[PDB]
Amino acid sequence: SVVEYEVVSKNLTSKMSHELLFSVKKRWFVKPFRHDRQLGKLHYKLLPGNYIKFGLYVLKNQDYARFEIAWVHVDKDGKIEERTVYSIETYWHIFIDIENDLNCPYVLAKFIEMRPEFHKTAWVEESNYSIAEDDIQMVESIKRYLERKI
Numbered sequence: 001s002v003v004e005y006e007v008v009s010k011n012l013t014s015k016m017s018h019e020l021l022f023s024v025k026k027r028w029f030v031k032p033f034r035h036d037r038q039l040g041k042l043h044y045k046l047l048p049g050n051y052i053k054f055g056l057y058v059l060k061n062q063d064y065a066r067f068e069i070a071w072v073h074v075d076k077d078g079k080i081e082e083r084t085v086y087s088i089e090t091y092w093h094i095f096i097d098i099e100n101d102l103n104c105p106y107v108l109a110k111f112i113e114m115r116p117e118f119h120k121t122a123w124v125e126e127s128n129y130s131i132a133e134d135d136i137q138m139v140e141s142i143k144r145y146l147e148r149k150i
């Protein structure tokens, strides 16, 4: 009882759109079944449950970065419903520097760091690691963090 879903992963000369799915249950990012470079898209095969889609849209030359957090809900009929639960606009040079922020949410640090290379998709490692926090605390800490950073 599986379902397929599509996020955008592309780093172009002018802009970058980087979305990745984080599993609520496994408390770490999801391995995509297929990375599509020709069109800048990843492909996931998701089991019924909840996951979270982090999004990072960047207009390089306008120093612009927006970061979104959306909640992805997959029920039994294989049906899919989405709602943004957070969205924030800010300069990109700030965003990129968040990687180096010693004390700052890890998954956020990880996310930014997994952005896709030029003309390519990103890709998720076969990891077994999980983070201490649960979906709620995780999102809050992230929110709470960027707030101060901004």
Ligand code: NI
Residues within 6 Å of the ligand: 073, 074, 075
């Ligand atoms: Ni439901």
Ligand code: NI
Residues within 6 Å of the ligand: 140, 143
């Ligand atoms: Ni909140």
